[PDB]
Design a protein around this nucleic acid. Sequence first.
DNA 1: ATTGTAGCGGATGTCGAGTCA
DNA 2: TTGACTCGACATCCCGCTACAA
Lengths: 53, 479
Amino acid sequence: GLTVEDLLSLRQVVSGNPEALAPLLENISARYPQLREHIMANPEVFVSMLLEA
Amino acid sequence: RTSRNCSSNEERKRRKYFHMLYLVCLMVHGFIRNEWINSKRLSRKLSNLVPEKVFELLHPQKDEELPLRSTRKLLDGLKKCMELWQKHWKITKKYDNEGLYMRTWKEIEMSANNFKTLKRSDFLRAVSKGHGDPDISVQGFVAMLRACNVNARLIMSCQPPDFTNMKIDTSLNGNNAYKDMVKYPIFWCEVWDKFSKKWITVDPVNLKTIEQVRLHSKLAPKGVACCERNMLRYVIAYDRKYGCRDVTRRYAQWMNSKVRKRRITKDDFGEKWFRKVITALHHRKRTKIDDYEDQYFFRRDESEGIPDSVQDLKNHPYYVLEQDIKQTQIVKPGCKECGYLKVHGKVGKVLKVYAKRDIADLKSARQWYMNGRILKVIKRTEEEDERLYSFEDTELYIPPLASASGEITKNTFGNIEVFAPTMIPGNCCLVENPVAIKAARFLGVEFAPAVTSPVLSGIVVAKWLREAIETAIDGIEFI
DNA sequence: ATTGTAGCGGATGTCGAGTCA
DNA sequence: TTGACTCGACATCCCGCTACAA
């Protein structure tokens, strides 16, 4: 379960500023350890989540 | 003597994870961009860029006696469109920094240390004005073709950081860095020819050519310098209708040897994860075009053959060197090598290549028992010689059913060995739980400890007793 | 004493670097 | 120019008994 401020920055980078993907991904992955095993088990969830926003 | 530029397996596993994370992000960016391309507001303005003559050229009439000439006309249309796009696109920028080209692990680590919010309007406005880097330029060109009702995919070569790069310091050559980085494009276009039933490759901005890729593509980077920042691994195609397809096999000359080593798809977990992602992104259902494509890919996959070097036969999907045959594998009777490899750098030195489908895996008696199968020379280590047997010497093991009272047949140590579902009796079930044994013993029902891996992980009890056990475990705090 | 408790890996693979033909 | 070969330090897969203590 993720905040709404990170999902906001992520929706915006992913959609309109992918040049800046690199450092943001460094940051956010460092603030949500469980994301690792999540991403390994259930990527399609994270996808749908990024599409709704 | 050793400056030892190598990192810990910890870093290895992190790099693999981040590689997956960056890839997934890339592919999402593509999906969304492909949305923004389908924008209905844009199409209507873009239509007026295309004279009726060009449009008619884009949709020629079926020519029955020689379909080729219709294709020929189609090609001329596509070229005139590319020309007016050169004309539509006035100011073509430089990628800021490295654009969407691959970044180095070092660059990443340091990118934390040191952005124009864009969104969808700004993209549209840009594409309509003709102001942007080459990525936007191509994207616009695909939008335009789409506004003319041609089935036009957007192709994206995803360049996440290389997770097979084990090195600590990863430093790049500076000479001609940008020119060599931009030598080949990150984005481009594919177009479906209904007459020849094939996808045409189109690069209108960087290389400005049009090709019908067979075994070689002008867009695939060659040499070494160009491939540091453009490492062709995941080529994704998005179509009008929100298809998403992995088309790497088209562009990789050696897909099964060279390229397979650099994709996450080389192990089984990987393949399954990638397919999960494609399905997450693939919102339409299979068409016949998919089948014409899959047939092309199959034929390509059967035309690659033995590679021209030994390094390319490590961990090849179809192919293996005689010397890499494991001590525990053998050649299926009456099979043989499917090919030879001239060995670079020794005259006349040749290696035997076998097809992997002709290789059999052998296991000892215990090893089979541990897969729930029983039977219908080498050196071990005290000294012993261990005989191995094939899978077809063996047969499922059906363990005896439990009694009326629910008694389970045990081993010398008073457990039952369950290393595989086959070895669960038919009328019985396995319940794995630290207290499952505590439970069953407390109920004093007939059971048998399960060895699933001297590790007692649980219980084997009759099925009629299942509902009871599940309840007792749940109440374990009250025992 | 006596019961509970605590102490002692080889074949094979991978990748980086350096070296050779 | 490129591939083969060797070498270095990691991994990965597969395969309970003696002695002491309160």
